[PDB]
Design a protein around this ligand. Structure first.
Ligand SMILES: *CCC(=O)N1CCN(c2ncnc3c(F)c(-c4c(O)cccc4F)c(Cl)cc23)CC1
Ligand SMILES: Nc1nc2c(ncn2[C@@H]2O[C@H](COP(=O)(O)OP(=O)(O)O)[C@@H](O)[C@H]2O)c(=O)[nH]1
Ligand SMILES: [Ca+2]
Ligand SMILES: [Ca+2]
Ligand SMILES: [Ca+2]
Ligand SMILES: [Ca+2]
Length: 169
């Protein structure tokens, strides 16, 4: 009854593919081709309404392309993924947000900030610092583990709720 294009972004190694493959195939990948980009589909009921999700798992290279702009423009909501043990990945979030804003030609784009790898003890990004970032962006923040599945469905489903909220703006 409604289709949603979701796009998963963030630095290399943060767990984009792991999170996506957990959601879709219900297993954790220890190693997955670091540059392949593909889309996945899945149907989910969220708040009583059937959602047909088309999920783009981004990767590729550190480069601009008009082709990438074109697929990114199709996205209706974005997961901004960092790893909680990788401060550089957190620092990179700003860039991803900016580039989304660019291609969507909009400051108000449905997004969720995702702190992945929450199962690891060696955290270098505080929950508070993320929460404050997400506050400044006006978006939710969810901590996930693709390894244990903690928060995986929540991250994706919260993004759909964000998209729904926006489509009524
Ligand atoms: C390990 C491979 C990997 O996961 N990645 C490769 C580097 N990526 C990446 N690097 C820099 N900038 C990126 C970027 F700006 C976008 C982006 C564009 O170009 C337009 C609109 C919205 C965007 F997020 C993307 Cl998709 C990837 C970028 C990805 C991570
Ligand atoms: N411990 C832990 N490792 C993870 C988690 N998510 C991803 N990884 C690992 O981190 C590495 C990169 O994951 P991947 O999904 O390929 O990252 P991507 O480059 O963002 O697509 C892999 O070794 C994964 O097994 C997580 O939640 N916990
Ligand atoms: Ca990947
Ligand atoms: Ca404009
Ligand atoms: Ca601005
Ligand atoms: Ca908002």
């Amino acid at each position: 009854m409604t289709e949603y294009k979701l796009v998963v972004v963030g630095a290399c190694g943060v767990g984009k593919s792991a999170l996506t493959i957990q959601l879709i195939q219900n297993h954790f990948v220890d190693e997955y081709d670091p540059t392949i980009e593909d889309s996945y589909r899945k149907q989910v009921v969220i708040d009583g309404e059937t959602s047909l999700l088309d999920i783009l798992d981004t990767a590729g290279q550190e480069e601009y392309s008009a082709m990438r702009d074109q697929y990114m423009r199709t996205g209706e909501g974005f997961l901004l993924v960092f790893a909680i043990n990788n401060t550089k990945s957190f620092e990179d979030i700003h860039h991803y947000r900016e580039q989304i804003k660019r291609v969507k030609d909009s400051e108000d784009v449905p997004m969720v900030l995702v702190g992945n790898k929450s199962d690891l003890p060696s955290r270098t990004v505080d929950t508070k610092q993320a929460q404050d970032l997400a506050r400044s962006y006006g978006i939710p923040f969810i901590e996930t583990s693709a390894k244990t599945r903690q928060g995986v469905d929540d991250a994706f489903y919260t993004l759909v709720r964000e998209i729904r909220k926006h489509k009524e703006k």
